[PDB]
Ligand binder design. Structure first.
Ligand SMILES: *[C@@H]1O[C@H](CO)[C@@H](O)[C@H](O)[C@H]1NC(C)=O
Ligand SMILES: *[C@@H]1O[C@H](CO)[C@@H](O)[C@H](O)[C@H]1NC(C)=O
Ligand SMILES: *[C@@H]1O[C@H](CO)[C@@H](O)[C@H](O)[C@H]1NC(C)=O
Ligand SMILES: *[C@@H]1O[C@H](CO)[C@@H](O)[C@H](O)[C@H]1NC(C)=O
Ligand SMILES: *[C@@H]1O[C@H](CO)[C@@H](O)[C@H](O)[C@H]1NC(C)=O
Ligand SMILES: *[C@@H]1O[C@H](CO)[C@@H](O)[C@H](O)[C@H]1NC(C)=O
Ligand SMILES: *[C@@H]1O[C@H](CO)[C@@H](O)[C@H](O)[C@H]1NC(C)=O
Ligand SMILES: *[C@@H]1O[C@H](CO)[C@@H](O)[C@H](O)[C@H]1NC(C)=O
Ligand SMILES: *[C@@H]1O[C@H](CO)[C@@H](O)[C@H](O)[C@H]1NC(C)=O
Ligand SMILES: *[C@@H]1O[C@H](CO)[C@@H](O)[C@H](O)[C@H]1NC(C)=O
Lengths: 362, 362
């Protein structure tokens, strides 16, 4: 008899892991009512209430951000986080607005997922401070009346006078047992032409460089609307310079350290949103794209009648996450199956394992 | 009885195409002896003797380059070219050497394959010239005694005096029937610190920019070994500027125009090399990576005892290309199969279609 895939994430061997927020964090005081996964699976997730891998990339604890040192290893990976940076947050640093932050978010998650498919371990690490320097200020946001906290990573600095300056930073090749064969590192900038301070409109730009790497940004057009934009870079371990065009410089203070596995396996991501009385975004659906990521979308709103509150304990995702309880043979966008000859519907890519073939063909 | 995959490329529907060189070019005077594909399949390939998609990206006809206006459409794609730019060519423009060109080649093919998996049609097009400008020279190579021809795409220019200048170029949204929903466009530069001309060491750099795009390069370090390096960019149709830091500017003159299909299908690439008495490279194997490309490597040298000459008519690839004669149900790194329940060996990803499962599991 042909088998019907269980819509939702799955795993074909015990070497699998998850990344999450409150909805997979057994440390939460409302556990198990606040969970969207089975409680027996919490030990498989690296998760913290209030956090997301995007938040933790850019911010330390404070000014409204709950940061977490995410760290896990698995050939197979399930991501269920992202919601803790949605338009609901009402954050802007310059004039990019909420949608500017949805764009940064898509950028981050797109790079994370594609890199994670080539990796087994993923670990947020702190970088050593750069070679010392002088006569500078840290950057601030003008957004939200100056209350918006600019990222701690990368760290922007502004020199007291126009200067020539290159400072050195290091991406390590390991972190307490994990090999960092590559790093996900942010590079952010403020576009919109020259940047006005105390009556002088300065060229804005800087770059990362080494003998085998370059990435930079520069503008000196007429001043217009300014936007804080981030690029997410894959960088090898080693020594780099951050270099100024005169007034501005950034250096990274954190990275996601990843190792490399030789067989690429698509990651899985589940739609991470709020209930309908808050502004969510579709950043996860935009970032989780074939062929590197298998997206399990919600077809209903986030509804938690048996949960801790209206934003924690969704029935649909709960049902989806029942899939992680079985030892499957096949993982696909249609969901998971045990070993079987025939499927009740066509299984498409991206998939992996041993997948049943659509019965009507035979 | 379990089926054995035919090692080599394949197709599951008639909507498939190929891209090639002499070894799939029925216009060649030694046809069919010079072919590595069956002759009945020539009408499925966009191919020219002496060319490659990498050559055609950068050069017009002449100075030793045979350029071709590659153009084809297929949900499924087989690439069999690349060899016509190997270290055998002995080309350098600055001091990057042959390996510098292997690196550019990997860059190009990596971007081409990944983009092509999201596209159906791929077409080399000529761009309109940029908005006019004055008091300039075209760049030249110092390599090979000044005999090395610098790419026609992108076109480097050097201004008579330090200047401020932004010029406009256009990536069109169509090309005679094909929708150009995206473009593969090169951006190349010369690294190694400031660039010495007539006693003055100039900062080297420039950028492409629009309100929704930036990509740039800049150096002003002490002069060292200079290398001509290329980045291969995915760009939306529309209007852009090329902008100088003072002395140098590039603008693109060609792109690969691609449309978009909504279901991503991995492309297939076959190892394109010379016989053992010439220097080949493994750029295709480095660029054709899971999950966007299925690489069929040669396990033997290029040997053509029944071919037109020692570089045309390989037995191994000939056998591989027999796969394209059948209407298969499954395409994989193990090769192609018709519809079947069971396989004699495990089928791995990337694959697509309906694939038999490994018999020993049942
Ligand atoms: C943030 O603070 C909490 C305690 O409130 C702690 O559990 C967590 O580890 C802190 N985050 C980081 C990144 O150190
Ligand atoms: C953000 O603004 C929206 C729209 O005004 C508001 O409804 C929402 O509660 C605000 N978010 C926070 C965290 O206060
Ligand atoms: C800038 O930020 C760093 C990292 O947050 C901090 O330790 C340092 O004290 C700040 N420097 C200045 C000059 O405010
Ligand atoms: C940047 O732009 C300003 C204002 O147009 C101009 O006067 C200045 O020369 C520019 N600076 C550089 C380094 O190009
Ligand atoms: C996911 O689902 C919602 C509505 O159910 C839809 O609006 C959104 O576009 C979907 N996104 C993707 C990428 O499927
Ligand atoms: C190069 O020249 C040949 C004739 O020798 C011609 O077939 C080919 O189309 C030319 N290439 C281009 C790109 O026009
Ligand atoms: C390139 O140089 C190699 C090594 O010296 C030589 O054997 C080969 O024939 C040269 N290539 C060409 C096209 O002449
Ligand atoms: C530079 O190259 C273009 C394109 O090849 C050519 O048409 C033009 O005549 C050249 N300009 C100069 C000043 O040599
Ligand atoms: C570039 O470097 C030279 C030589 O070190 C220096 O004198 C010059 O001021 C620099 N130019 C700019 C625009 O920074
Ligand atoms: C392909 O084959 C050759 C030798 O048969 C080997 O040296 C090369 O590394 C191979 N490359 C890949 C990526 O498999």
């Amino acid at each position: 008899k042909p088998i019907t895939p269980h819509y939702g994430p799955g795993h074909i061997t015990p070497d699998w892991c998850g990344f999450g927020d409150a909805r997979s964090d057994c440390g939460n005081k409302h556990t198990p009512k606040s969970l969207d996964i089975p409680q027996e699976l919490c030990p498989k997730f690296s998760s913290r209430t209030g956090s997301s891998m995007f938040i933790s990339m850019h911010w330390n604890n404070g000014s409204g951000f709950d940061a977490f040192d995410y760290s896990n290893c698995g050939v197979e990976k399930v991501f269920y986080e992202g919601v803790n940076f949605s338009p609901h947050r009402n954050y802007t640093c310059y004039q990019e607005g909420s949608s500017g932050w949805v764009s940064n978010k898509v950028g981050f998650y797109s790079k994370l997922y594609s890199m994670a498919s080539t990796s087994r371990c993923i670990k947020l690490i702190n970088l050593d401070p750069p070679t010392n320097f002088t006569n500078y200020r840290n950057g601030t946001c003008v957004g939200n009346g100056g209350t918006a906290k600019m990222p701690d990573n990368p760290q922007l600095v502004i020199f007291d006078a126009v200067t020539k300056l290159s400072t050195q930073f290091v991406l390590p090749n390991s972190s307490d047992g994990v090999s960092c064969t590559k790093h996900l590192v942010p590079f952010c900038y403020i576009d919109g032409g020259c940047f006005e301070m105390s009556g002088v409109c300065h060229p804005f730009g800087y770059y990362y460089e080494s003998p085998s790497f370059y990435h930079g940004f520069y503008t000196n057009g007429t001043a217009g609307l300014h936007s804080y934009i981030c690029d997410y870079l894959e960088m090898k371990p080693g020594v780099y310079n951050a270099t100024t065009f005169g007034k501005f410089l950034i250096y990274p203070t954190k990275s996601y350290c990843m190792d490399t596995m030789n067989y690429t396996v698509p990651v899985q991501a589940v739609q991470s949103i709020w209930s309908e009385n808050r502004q969510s975004d579709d950043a996860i659906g935009q970032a989780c794209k074939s062929p590197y990521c298998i997206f399990y979308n919600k077809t209903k709103p986030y509804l938690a009648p048996n949960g801790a509150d209206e934003n924690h304990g969704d029935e649909e995702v709960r049902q989806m996450m029942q899939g992680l309880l079985v030892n499957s043979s096949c993982v696909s966008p249609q969901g998971s199956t045990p070993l079987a000859l025939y499927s009740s519907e066509m299984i498409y890519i991206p998939n992996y394992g041993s997948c049943p073939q659509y019965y009507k063909l035979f």
